[PDB]
Amino acid sequence: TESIVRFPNITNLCPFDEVFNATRFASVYAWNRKRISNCVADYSVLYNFAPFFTFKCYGVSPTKLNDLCFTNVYADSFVIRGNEVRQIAPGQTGNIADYNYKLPDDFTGCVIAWNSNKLDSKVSGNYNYLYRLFRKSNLKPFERDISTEIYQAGNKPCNGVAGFNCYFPLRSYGFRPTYGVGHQPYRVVVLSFELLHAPATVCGPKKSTNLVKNKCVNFNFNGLTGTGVLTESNKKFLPFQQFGRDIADTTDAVRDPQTLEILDITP
Ligand SMILES: *[C@@H]1O[C@H](CO)[C@@H](O)[C@H](O)[C@H]1NC(C)=O
Ligand SMILES: *[C@@H]1O[C@H](CO)[C@@H](O)[C@H](O)[C@H]1NC(C)=O
């Protein structure tokens, strides 16, 4: 008869505006990995800061962010012109994944991109389009290189600034506000979430309800749905552990975000 929800007891607001609005985002070879934690994230009011997006949610559904808790949310905003907006996907690779921002083979999270045909085009370009071109090692997921190189591919090992046979990476784009359409820049803002892990920091809309510990409920502990009976526990949960699993995939024990009480779950 009850539908108690047990979202964590925080009331802070998330730094979304400090990331999406900005003035200058980043370069595509050196992105900023901003941490979002310990704040209520209302994902409904996002469509006003930068509309005409894609939202490309490889994982949690577009309308389901305001349903569950996230332990760590990381947003990486940079500029890639117009050709790798769909090549930022985990399957695709090339000169934008092996030598730039790389998404992992498995990945939960969504990306946001909108056009910059006049706002971030500038006269003769803003010249902050530094892409690593090529290097010796294909980049690991979520890895950047703050470095220059004199890449050669190997003949008469050279470290000089000369272009021929001592090729210099870190080129850039840049133009007058009009060009052949395809080069017009785009502001890509990714959103990488993570689940399980530590006690959750980012939750969303809070609808916390009191506890009844000897009857059946439709409980909701940090976004997970379950039907069963809650009760006190005599287990030996270590302070870092969060959930209590059994022989199968279900959870028979859980720790509430407040009052830190281990609670057994039985149907
Ligand atoms: C970005 O900040 C400016 C003030 O510097 C404000 O006028 C503008 O509305 C903001 N854009 C948003 C919140 O999308
Ligand atoms: C959140 O919940 C309790 C009761 O509403 C509140 O008094 C307290 O500030 C929070 N819990 C903890 C453990 O801080």
Residue numbers in the entry: 323 to 589
Please give sentences taken from the publication describing this entry:
Owing to multiple mutations to the spike protein, including in the receptor-binding domain (RBD) and N-terminal domain, Omicron BA.1 infection can result in substantial NAb evasion. The Omicron variants that have emerged more recently contain similar RBD sequences to BA.2, with the addition of L452 and F486 substitutions—L452Q in BA.2.12.1, L452M in BA.2.13 and L452R/F486V in BA.4 and BA.5—and exhibit a transmission advantage over BA. We expressed and purified the prefusion-stabilized trimeric ectodomains of BA.1, BA.2, BA.3, BA.2.12.1, BA.2.13 and BA.4/BA.5 spike (S-trimer). We determined the cryo-electron microscopy (cryo-EM) structures of these S-trimers at overall resolutions of 3.1–3.5 Å.
However, a local conformational perturbation surrounding spike residues 444–448 disrupted the hydrophilic interaction between BA.3 spike (S446) with hACE2 Q42, presumably owing to the single mutation G446S rather than double mutations of G446S and G496S. Group D antibodies were most affected by the G446S mutation in BA.1, BA.1.1 and BA.3; these NAbs therefore show higher potency against BA.2.
